[PDB]
Amino acid sequence: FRRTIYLAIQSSLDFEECAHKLLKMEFPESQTKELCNMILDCCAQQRTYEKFFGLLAGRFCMLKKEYMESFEGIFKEQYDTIHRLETNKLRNVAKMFAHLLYTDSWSVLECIKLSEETTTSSSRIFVKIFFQELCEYMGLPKLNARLKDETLQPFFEDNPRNTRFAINFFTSIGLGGLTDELREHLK
Amino acid sequence: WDDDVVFKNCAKGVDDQKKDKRFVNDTLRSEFHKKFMEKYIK
Amino acid sequence: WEKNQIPNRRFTLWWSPTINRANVYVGFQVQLDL
Amino acid sequence: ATVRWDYQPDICKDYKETGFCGFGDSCKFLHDRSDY
Amino acid sequence: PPPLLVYKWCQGINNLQDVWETSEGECNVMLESRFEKMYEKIDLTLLNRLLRLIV
Amino acid sequence: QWENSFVSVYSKDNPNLLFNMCGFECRILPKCRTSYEEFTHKDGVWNLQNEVTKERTAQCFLRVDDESMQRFHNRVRQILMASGSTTFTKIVNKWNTALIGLMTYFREAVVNTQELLDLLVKCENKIQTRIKIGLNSKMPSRFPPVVFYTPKELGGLGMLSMGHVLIPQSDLRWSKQTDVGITHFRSGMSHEEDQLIPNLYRYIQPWESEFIDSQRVWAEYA
Amino acid sequence: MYNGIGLPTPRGSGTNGYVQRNLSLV
Amino acid sequence: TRLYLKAEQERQHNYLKDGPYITAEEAVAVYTTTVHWLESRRFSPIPFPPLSYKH
Amino acid sequence: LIQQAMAKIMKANPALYVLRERIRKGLQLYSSEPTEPYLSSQNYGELFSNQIIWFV
Amino acid sequence: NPRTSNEVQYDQRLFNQSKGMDSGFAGGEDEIYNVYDQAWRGGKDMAQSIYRPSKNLDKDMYG
Amino acid sequence: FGTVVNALGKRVKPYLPQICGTVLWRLNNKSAKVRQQAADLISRTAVVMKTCQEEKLMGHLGVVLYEYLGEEYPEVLGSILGALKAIVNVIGMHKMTPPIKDLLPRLTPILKNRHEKVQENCIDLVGRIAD
Amino acid sequence: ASEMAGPPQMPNDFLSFQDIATEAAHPIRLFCRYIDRIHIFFRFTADEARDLIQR
Ligand SMILES: [Zn+2]
Numbered sequence: 001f002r003r004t005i006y007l008a009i010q011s012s013l014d015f016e017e018c019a020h021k022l023l024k025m026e027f028p029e030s031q032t033k034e035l036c037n038m039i040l041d042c043c044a045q046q047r048t049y050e051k052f053f054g055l056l057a058g059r060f061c062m063l064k065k066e067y068m069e070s071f072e073g074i075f076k077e078q079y080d081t082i083h084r085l086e087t088n089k090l091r092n093v094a095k096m097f098a099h100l101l102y103t104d105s106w107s108v109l110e111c112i113k114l115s116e117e118t119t120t121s122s123s124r125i126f127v128k129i130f131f132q133e134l135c136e137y138m139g140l141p142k143l144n145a146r147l148k149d150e151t152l153q154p155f156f157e158d159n160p161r162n163t164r165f166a167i168n169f170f171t172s173i174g175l176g177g178l179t180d181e182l183r184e185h186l187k
Numbered sequence: 188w189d190d191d192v193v194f195k196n197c198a199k200g201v202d203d204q205k206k207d208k209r210f211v212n213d214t215l216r217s218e219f220h221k222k223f224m225e226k227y228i229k
Numbered sequence: 230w231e232k233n234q235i236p237n238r239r240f241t242l243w244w245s246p247t248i249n250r251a252n253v254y255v256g257f258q259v260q261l262d263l
Numbered sequence: 264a265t266v267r268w269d270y271q272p273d274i275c276k277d278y279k280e281t282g283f284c285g286f287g288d289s290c291k292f293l294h295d296r297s298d299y
Numbered sequence: 300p301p302p303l304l305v306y307k308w309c310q311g312i313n314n315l316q317d318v319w320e321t322s323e324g325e326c327n328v329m330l331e332s333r334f335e336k337m338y339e340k341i342d343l344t345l346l347n348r349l350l351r352l353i354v
Numbered sequence: 355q356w357e358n359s360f361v362s363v364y365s366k367d368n369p370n371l372l373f374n375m376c377g378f379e380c381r382i383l384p385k386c387r388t389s390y391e392e393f394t395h396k397d398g399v400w401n402l403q404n405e406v407t408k409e410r411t412a413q414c415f416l417r418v419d420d421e422s423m424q425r426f427h428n429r430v431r432q433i434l435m436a437s438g439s440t441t442f443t444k445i446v447n448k449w450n451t452a453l454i455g456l457m458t459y460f461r462e463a464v465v466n467t468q469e470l471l472d473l474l475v476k477c478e479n480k481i482q483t484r485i486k487i488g489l490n491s492k493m494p495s496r497f498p499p500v501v502f503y504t505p506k507e508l509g510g511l512g513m514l515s516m517g518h519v520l521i522p523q524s525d526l527r528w529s530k531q532t533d534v535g536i537t538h539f540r541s542g543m544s545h546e547e548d549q550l551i552p553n554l555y556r557y558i559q560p561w562e563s564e565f566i567d568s569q570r571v572w573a574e575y576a
Numbered sequence: 577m578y579n580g581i582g583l584p585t586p587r588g589s590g591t592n593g594y595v596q597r598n599l600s601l602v
Numbered sequence: 603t604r605l606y607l608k609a610e611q612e613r614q615h616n617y618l619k620d621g622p623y624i625t626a627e628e629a630v631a632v633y634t635t636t637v638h639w640l641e642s643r644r645f646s647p648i649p650f651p652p653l654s655y656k657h
Numbered sequence: 658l659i660q661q662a663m664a665k666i667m668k669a670n671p672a673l674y675v676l677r678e679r680i681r682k683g684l685q686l687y688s689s690e691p692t693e694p695y696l697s698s699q700n701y702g703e704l705f706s707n708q709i710i711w712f713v
Numbered sequence: 714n715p716r717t718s719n720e721v722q723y724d725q726r727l728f729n730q731s732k733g734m735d736s737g738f739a740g741g742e743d744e745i746y747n748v749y750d751q752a753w754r755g756g757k758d759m760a761q762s763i764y765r766p767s768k769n770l771d772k773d774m775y776g
Numbered sequence: 777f778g779t780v781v782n783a784l785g786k787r788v789k790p791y792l793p794q795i796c797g798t799v800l801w802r803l804n805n806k807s808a809k810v811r812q813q814a815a816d817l818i819s820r821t822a823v824v825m826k827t828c829q830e831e832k833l834m835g836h837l838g839v840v841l842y843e844y845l846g847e848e849y850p851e852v853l854g855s856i857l858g859a860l861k862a863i864v865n866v867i868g869m870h871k872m873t874p875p876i877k878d879l880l881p882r883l884t885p886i887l888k889n890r891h892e893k894v895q896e897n898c899i900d901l902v903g904r905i906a907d
Numbered sequence: 908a909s910e911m912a913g914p915p916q917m918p919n920d921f922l923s924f925q926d927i928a929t930e931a932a933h934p935i936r937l938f939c940r941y942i943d944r945i946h947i948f949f950r951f952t953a954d955e956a957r958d959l960i961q962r
Contacts, residue, residue, distance in 0.1 A: 007550040010557070013465045013519050014396045016536060020600040021520070048559050048567060051397040063600065091570075103394055137401075139409030193631040215608060228606040230507065231685040232806075234288035237441040241489065242683055243509040244501050254493060258264040262272060282885045289439075297881045301376040302459070302561050304939075306400070308375055309382065309414045311922035311937055312948060313402035316930050319384040319412065321366040326956050328949035329373040332359035337943050339613075342624055348633055352640060354648040375939070375946055433743070448743035455741075472589075479590030507753040514748070523595065526580040537601060538581050541594040639908070644915045671835050678843055687804050689756045690763050757806075 001027055005038045015055040023063070036060060036070045037077075040096075049092040051099070058105040071100070072108050079111075083120030090122065094129020101130075102137040106146050113154035114166050128173055135175055147178050160186060274298075378463060379417040386411070397560040398466035416463035418470055426456050430477045434484055442485045446502075446511040449481050453514050453554065462560045471521050475542040478517040485511070498546045518543045518551040664703065778820035789828045795821070796833055800840065808849050815841075815855035819862040826866035837863060838873035845882055853886075854893030861901045869905075880905055911938065 005022065012018040027035070036057055043053025061068035075097065085093075101109075112127060113119065120126075135143055147156075157163060163186050170176040211217045241248060275292030278284040282296060312318060318327065362372040369387040373380055382402070383389060400414040433448040453474075457464060464470055482502055486492055504510020520539040528534045545551070559567075578595075586593030617623075624632075667673070681687070696702055704710055739745050752758050781788050799821075802814040818825075818837055825833050841860055847853045860879075869876065886898050910929055913919040922937055924930050934955055937948035951959075 007552070010552040011519065011550050013471075013553060013555050014522075016396070016600070017520055017522075017539075020539065020598060024599040048563065050559055050563055052556070052560075055394065055396070063602075099394075136403060136408050137410055139404070139407050141407075141409075193628065193635065215605075215612075220605075221609075224605055224609050230509070231687070233439045233441065236443055237488070239684060240442055240509075240511075242680075247498070247501065248489065248496055250496065253495065256264075258266055259269050260266050262269050282881060296885075297877070301941075302378065302461075303565060304941075305375050305378050305380065306561070306565055307921055308937070308939060308946070309380065309400065310402055310405070312371075312382065313412050314405050315936060315950065316927055318950065319364075319386045321387075324366065324953040326951045326953070327364035327371065328947075328951065329362040329364075329371060330359070330945070330947040330949065331361075331374055332945045333355075334943045334945070335355050335358065340623075342622055342629075344622065345624060345629055345632070349636060352633075352636060352647075354650075373946070376941065444744060447746050450748055451741070451743055451745065454748065476588065476590035505753065512748075517590070521591075522598075523581045524598075537598050538595055539598055540582060541591055541596075543590065544592060642909055642915075643912070671832060671839075674836070675839050675843070678840060681804065682843055682846065687807060688801075689806060691802055691805050691810075692764065692798070693801055 001031055001035070002038055005035055006042060009039070009042065009053075009056070015052045015059065018052075018056055019059050019063070022060075029064075029066075032064070032066055033070045033073065036067065037074055040071075040074050044089050044092045044096060046092075047088075049095050054096045054099045058100050058103065061105055068105060071105065075108060076111065078126075082123035082126060085122060087122070087125060090126045090129060094126055094131075095133035098130055098133030098137070102134050107150055107152070109150070110152045110154060114169060115162060116165055117162075131170075131173055131175060140175060140177055144178055156182065374419055377419050377422045377460070379419045381415040381417070382412055383415070384412040389413075396465055397462045397562055400462075400562055416466060418460050418463045418467040422460075423467075423470060423473060426452065427473060427477070429455075430480065434480060442488050443506065443511060445481060445485065446513045449478075450512070450514045453516065457516065457554050457558060461555070461558055462562065464555060468521065471517075471519065471542070475517040475521065478513075478515060479543065482513075494544070499549075499551065500546075503551060514554055515551055516554045518545065519553055664700075667703075668698065777817065781821060781824050786828050788824060792825065792828070792830060792833065796825070796836065800836070803840070808852060811844075811847070811849070811852040812855035815852065815859045818859040819855070822859075822862035822866045834863070834867055835873045842874045842879065842882075845886070850889060850891035850894045853889070854897045857883075857894065857897035857901055861897060861904060864901065864904050876905060 004025065004027070008021040008025070009018045012021055022035075039053060039057045039060070043050060046053065057071055061071055078093075114127075138146065156166065163182055167176070167179040167182050167186065170179045206218055209218070214220060273293045274295055275284055275290055278290070278292075278294050279296055284290045284292075284294065317325075360374065364371045369383060371382040373382075385392065398416055400416065401410040402412045402414055403409065404411045429452045430449075433445060433452065437445055437448070482497070483492070485502070486497055491497070500510070502511050502513045503515055504512070506512040519542050521542050522536040522538070523540050524537040525534050582595045583589050583591075583593055622629075738747060756763075799814055799817060802810055805811070805814075818841070825837070837859070841856055841863070844856045845853070847856065864872070867873075872879070880902070883898065883902060886894065889895060889898070910924065910932065911919065913925050917925075919925065930936065934949050934951055935947065936950045937946075939946040
């Protein structure tokens, strides 16, 4: 199954065609986790970020309710390898989730946390990018909305120290225009 | 504006001319030949 | 590999088991001379 | 399927006799030299 | 490279001031053309004086 | 000359802004006009991002210009015609060179031009058909794709092949007007078995992405 | 039903003309 | 090729017979304009390559 | 006797070696590695072959 | 006296890898091939010799 | 190698098949480097491959080397012809496994070959057989 | 043209101006020349357009 996926995806122009080629084959559904695990790995492992492999993962979600679930899971599966993956492929990912999350395939984030406690310098960069991409689409205002209604905590709190780590860290990223309220809270 | 230019209007009385109404019995000076020559050489 | 002449002609030998087949649509099976 | 002998050889007669083909490497024929 | 030029050209358009605003009746015009015969009509005598200004 | 020139105009009556630079036919549709449903698409769609507000303010569609397609087609025709003598491995080199010449250059714009996909398919079929002619057969069972697509390290011809892809087809009547989308696919080329063949376009990084990558890479480099 | 789709005739096309419907549409 | 070179020889011969088409005052306008441009642009002329030139 | 004799000849007979060599030359194939892998007369090279064969 | 320079600039291992000038790749001739940057296998890629024997390194590092 | 073998005399006989096996397999390898060298190895090992009366080996070297005469690399081909030469000086005329009727006209066209070593060994061999 | 190339002491890049007011100062906005081909992008207020149309 894993090999057929690759060949179907490498064959097809567009992102539309690979899904048609893939669905058409009517490969067994439960595997609908690992398949998608395949797509996330197959391009992300692939050398540079390309728009195609990210779109495919998402459509594959809208067509069946599970595919969406299959993805959100696979995003979780990252925690273990947030440190482990080498510092290129984070450049493919950060954006690559950026494009599922700008286009609505946000609150699944919340699971992600900012602490010197446990964050991988890997993970640090991962999330770093993720915002420096998703911003560049929503443009830091619609992002102001999405956050303000988000209730993302492990990211956004207690822990005045961790509010220095948070807010400071978003001065480092550079956006730091959604860190205001927290600045007030420091005070 | 364009307060500044080299040239006052060149295109004053230039009404095409009957070069494509003239038929010419000369293979190299027919207007057809000119058009052909214009088109296919660079 | 060898790092209007043979190279074409060579390409045929290499696939000759595939190019020439006992099963074909239409053909008259011929024996080479000797 | 019946079998028919191919008996015609492809040997280039110029090269078989002389040993030099005017067509050079482009020759449509065998080049194999001097067999009986 | 030429395609990158195309990109500089598009985002160059989109970054112009109030470029797409039709509110007051603004009108944008894209124009593409050639000089037709340019090489063939260069005059050598003139070209000499033009180069004397350079080198 | 007005004849060779071209003009486009953007006004409250005309949403779309068309133009042609280099080989590219470009359209630009703002989101401030009627964009209706906002949507993504294949990388053939560029997002024009305001430098100031980091927002996507419009979309540029790419399409491979006519005269370009014409040049490529005359290039294939050059390969067929100018070679009656030359070896079959040599022709495949000619094809590969021309084909990457098109694809590395255009990339994204290729996928949004159906006419190209057709042209590539028929042209692959013409050079392979010519190599067939080269030996004496047209018989498909005597030329399965394994002979053309084997990298010549193993003794194939190493043909780069973009033309086994499916070709999207929907509603000519409406597709001449409203851009309906894809309700059908046409088979580009044959496969002996179900099988597969990889496409060049999938292995080339799109121009948009390599641009963004360029900016980021340089800044990080400094 | 050739619904205005496909080639008039798969003669010069390089293909077998085969049109199956888009299995993933919506 | 032969046609094109014929009409070519025609155009050369007609350019000698009919004299320069740029007229005169126009040409002065060009030369003057270019002069003003290079003036405001502080462009220094490109000199002749010296015998000793490290590049 | 016939098994052993055939297995030997297929490795041995000069005529077959002339055929094989002519094939190599016409194909212009040339091996990369000297001394060849560890072939000896050992029966495993011919042992994989087409024939499905097991070790127990 | 240290030997000092402004800034740092760059190391060395890389600072001289790829050829020079060389120019693209022919006018753009068909005959060229050259599409692939590295060979297919590691048969000729991996080593000059697939096999060399010895226990020299063996009985040295052995102890 | 040559001096070692010629010094060992026929004490070397049990070792031949290993030798010449290596000689053929190397006689392929990758062309321009080692072909000429394995060829020359044959050339200098001729007499030893003769006096011990291994005739199969002379069949081998005879027709096998006979086949390489179409080699396009001159620096190889020269060594090949040299090897043939040395084989002629051990086994005689009428016993040549590639009978001269075959060989000589197959040699004749090579004389155009320009580059040196070919012309040298070639003309030499045409000399030995012609004489 | 001088506005586009800007001051020779601090020249501009491909597409950009010293200031916004230099963008709004004139109908011609983007001017790209590729060998002999001309690509031009115009911004007009209604009045300027009307004037052109009337001429
Ligand atoms: Zn001949």
